[PDB]
Design an enzyme around this catalytic site. Sequence first.
Site, PDB file in Angstrom:
ATOM      1  CE  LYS B 186      -2.828   3.309   1.715  1.00  0.00           C
ATOM      2  NZ  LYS B 186      -1.907   4.557   2.104  1.00  0.00           N
ATOM      3  CD  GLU B 262      12.642   0.288   9.807  1.00  0.00           C
ATOM      4  OE1 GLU B 262      13.077   1.616   9.863  1.00  0.00           O
ATOM      5  OE2 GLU B 262      13.306  -0.612  10.139  1.00  0.00           O
ATOM      6  CB  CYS B 296      11.599   8.373  10.515  1.00  0.00           C
ATOM      7  SG  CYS B 296      12.847   7.531   9.603  1.00  0.00           S
ATOM      8  CD  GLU B 393       8.304  11.919  13.763  1.00  0.00           C
ATOM      9  OE1 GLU B 393       7.217  11.331  13.430  1.00  0.00           O
ATOM     10  OE2 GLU B 393       9.540  11.252  13.802  1.00  0.00           O
TER      11      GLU B 393
HETATM   12  C1  LIG Z   1      12.874   6.459   8.142  1.00  0.00           C
HETATM   13  C2  LIG Z   1      13.566   6.852   6.896  1.00  0.00           C
HETATM   14  C3  LIG Z   1      14.279   8.263   6.709  1.00  0.00           C
HETATM   15  O1  LIG Z   1      13.528   9.009   7.173  1.00  0.00           O
HETATM   16  C4  LIG Z   1      15.160   8.534   5.892  1.00  0.00           C
HETATM   17  C5  LIG Z   1      15.798   9.598   6.105  1.00  0.00           C
HETATM   18  C6  LIG Z   1      16.972   9.917   5.330  1.00  0.00           C
HETATM   19  C7  LIG Z   1      17.506   9.278   4.182  1.00  0.00           C
HETATM   20  C8  LIG Z   1      18.695   9.695   3.335  1.00  0.00           C
HETATM   21  C9  LIG Z   1      19.365  10.699   4.077  1.00  0.00           C
HETATM   22  C10 LIG Z   1      16.754   7.963   3.966  1.00  0.00           C
HETATM   23  C11 LIG Z   1      15.429   7.593   4.458  1.00  0.00           C
END
Ligand SMILES: *CCC(=O)c1ccc(CC)cc1
EC number: 1.2.1.3
Lengths: 494, 494
Positions: B186, B262, B296, B393
């Site tokens: 999804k 996550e 995140c 957040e």
């Molecule tokens: C949870 C994944 C996420 O927010 C994120 C943040 C940064 C990058 C590349 C810098 C990938 C994924």
Amino acid sequence: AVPAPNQQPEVFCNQIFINNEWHDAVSRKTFPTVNPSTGEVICQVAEGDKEDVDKAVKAARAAFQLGSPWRRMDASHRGRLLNRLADLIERDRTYLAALETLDNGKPYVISYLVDLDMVLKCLRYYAGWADKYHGKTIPIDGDFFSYTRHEPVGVCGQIIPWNFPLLMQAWKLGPALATGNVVVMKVAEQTPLTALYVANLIKEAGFPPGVVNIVPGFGPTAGAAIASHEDVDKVAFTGSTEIGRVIQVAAGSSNLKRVTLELGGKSPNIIMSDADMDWAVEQAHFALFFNQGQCCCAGSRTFVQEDIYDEFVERSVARAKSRVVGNPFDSKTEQGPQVDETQFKKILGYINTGKQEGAKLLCGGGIAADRGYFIQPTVFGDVQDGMTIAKEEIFGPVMQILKFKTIEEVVGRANNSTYGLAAAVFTKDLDKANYLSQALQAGTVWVNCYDVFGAQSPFGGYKMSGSGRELGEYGLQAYTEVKTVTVKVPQKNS
Amino acid sequence: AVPAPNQQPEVFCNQIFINNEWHDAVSRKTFPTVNPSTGEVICQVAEGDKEDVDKAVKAARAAFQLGSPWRRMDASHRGRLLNRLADLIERDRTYLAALETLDNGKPYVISYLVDLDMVLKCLRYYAGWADKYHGKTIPIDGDFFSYTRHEPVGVCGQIIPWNFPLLMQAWKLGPALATGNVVVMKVAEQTPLTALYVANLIKEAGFPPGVVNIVPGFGPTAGAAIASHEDVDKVAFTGSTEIGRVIQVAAGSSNLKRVTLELGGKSPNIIMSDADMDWAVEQAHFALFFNQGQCCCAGSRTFVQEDIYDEFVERSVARAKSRVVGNPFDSKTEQGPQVDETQFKKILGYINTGKQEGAKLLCGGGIAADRGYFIQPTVFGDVQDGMTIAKEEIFGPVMQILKFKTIEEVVGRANNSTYGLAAAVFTKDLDKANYLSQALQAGTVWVNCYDVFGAQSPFGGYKMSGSGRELGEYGLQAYTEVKTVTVKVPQKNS
Ligand SMILES: *CCC(=O)c1ccc(CC)cc1
Ligand SMILES: *CCC(=O)c1ccc(CC)cc1
Ligand code: NA
Ligand code: NA
């Protein structure tokens, strides 16, 4: 050689174990544990509840603080401790085996030669892992040094059942402690006493206060408290598929704690026409009747290829009739009582349903004594897949025998279940053995054997028989939190 | 060194993807997806619901049947197919990056150089894993040969958020397809398009029909169906802590499907007084503001040691003040809009709550354009642990700076959170770096850098930031079901 038992072992520990000390319940309530061979009370046990759980959790949390003795202990030293625990259990083997039999029902010969042996092997196996579960250095892109730390997940709630009280305790303690976790354990109201004694051995072994805590008590109270607690990081539950779900919801509704589950099964034991007949008959009997039938992976659907059906059945009925029921302290006894009255009556109900729905009662089918929860070794033949006794886990000495024609058919019928804990295949043929062990949807597939566990080999369910695995290297995964550390460095070379 | 974008890329894919074909919602209903840079509708998209999810699941389940093309395919060939898909993604890199920008708001240069690069790296990394994730042969006691098969978990539901549409799809598909699973995915309502086009490349690459199915739609409908389905073996959810509880409850309430999560974070970025000042300022900037603050693992609590607090704050203000907001299709733009209206107002609210609870506002703090969802780069100073902006957040371009004195102090404050996704430490001192990286309760700790991800390095939460890891070898664990096979043999020898 089994050393002679004490048929009336004295009880020494019967309270809540916290911080290496013995506490009454906060309410001062006790509950009776019962000797299922005589129906009589062994002794009263402290009846833990939410407030006792909260005392145990805070004890554990404190034991887990950065800087504490348990946290700073060398991983090799956790090993030593687990090795010392096992030596102590071994010194006290005849006593613990007698006590397991007194409170549980199983034959003392089995307690001694099997349960206690497997406890020792489990603890000594995991002692070995304590300092060998390595993190990684990782060749990430760019000028970085990246590695992982395998850290403990933390405060671990463990809820264990009554069918293998000491062995389930060891299966939970071994991995948790090997990897530096601390434990709040809830033992079964039917079988509290052996786990409490071990707690005394844990103290003797030299484990720091608060590392292992045990709260005997009831399920709706003590167990539910552990599963819902906001400061428990991880819960591991073994019991019925039904309560398994209760635990998983409670974990999702509380603090999103990590869950693993070892639940029921309706395991298929498939006998091909080329099987060795003598071996297959004896193994199928073991597969079902072991531990009074009170095994999550009991071989409770014995599928037999039609060409050997009549003979297999005849020999299986003869083995069941010859199976000695009685005093689990008698060296001659193969089968003791069921664990309690509730189980006793559940089993008699399932037998009634087997009769009602038209499966052929071939022997047994009723109570086996005037006192204690003893049930006759019972065999149903001509069982069909739609019958209740072919679908629901009975957890008793009740054997179902089903007839099949082809290897393709038996695969589909074996796998047509919401359960998937275990399965077995009996055959002389290489290709059939490989075809079946690949096709069967089960956590463990035995080939020409049954109920063969090693501390070395993982065990756990497919489907609704559970999630995650215990024993082996896999048993450490659930007790580890993985931290990645990624450091900028001046200029990476290979 | 980037190719010029088409700033209005044609949309070719806007339906539900099942069995390698496009389907309308059973209900014929569609929904709008909006270009957050202008607030205008890009196009309509099929609105998936329970009934379409059920279709996808049956499709997936069929592709997963023993003996099917996907189940029979060589492990190494699953690898070839992942590599071919990455090649197709690389062929269409320029288009996909523009389309990501149009639907998400992130600057096109970043889409091209970062997002699409990491998509390619991830799929290529996981293609390598396809034939290398071995089971074990195990030296169990007795005359037995015992081994494990690493089998696929089965039908996997995968729910992915809107902040990194393509990357999150790759992080999900990579490990799942490498290990031979089938997928019902999804995608987020705000960013359905890029993933639907990749769905076309998946067909083009030659994946069998039913192996990946994508149902766009809303959370309460499409998402919940997946979570609750009786025939989904495993769900992976990325998004908010709030919905993460819904998922785990729905799994325990349904079929006990395996779960990984996550979720959110409030990540501490800790600047020691011995840090490299220019470097730490720019990294702390990047750490918070990257991707419009929509990460995140945003460094959303910047702790700065008191001796350098003043200058660092000062230096951060100058950098926040010169951060180019603008059309994300323009090569100078550093920040585009937030992803939609709801987020856009939530972030303004948080900024109100911030003023109003006594944090010092040091620059920006309002809307930044009349058209679209552009917020100004916002820095709060003198923030305290108690304030809402220090706990919750925000997921936008609002930086909190807090002051501390000691290393022991900052640890306690950093760790005082129901979150535990990421953390960082900026220092020149070896002992400080090692002390902090050990002590911080976080899934990833960066030293002298931020937001450094490798396909090789696992990533996931402590505490309520989630559970399970994505990426590296560990990213395979959740996609594998372990079968033990234990075979009687004539006489075991070492
Ligand atoms: C949870 C994944 C996420 O927010 C994120 C943040 C940064 C990058 C590349 C810098 C990938 C994924
Ligand atoms: C769930 C574990 C269980 O029921 C079991 C069955 C057999 C044995 C040894 C034969 C141990 C544990
Ligand atoms: Na008892
Ligand atoms: Na959009």
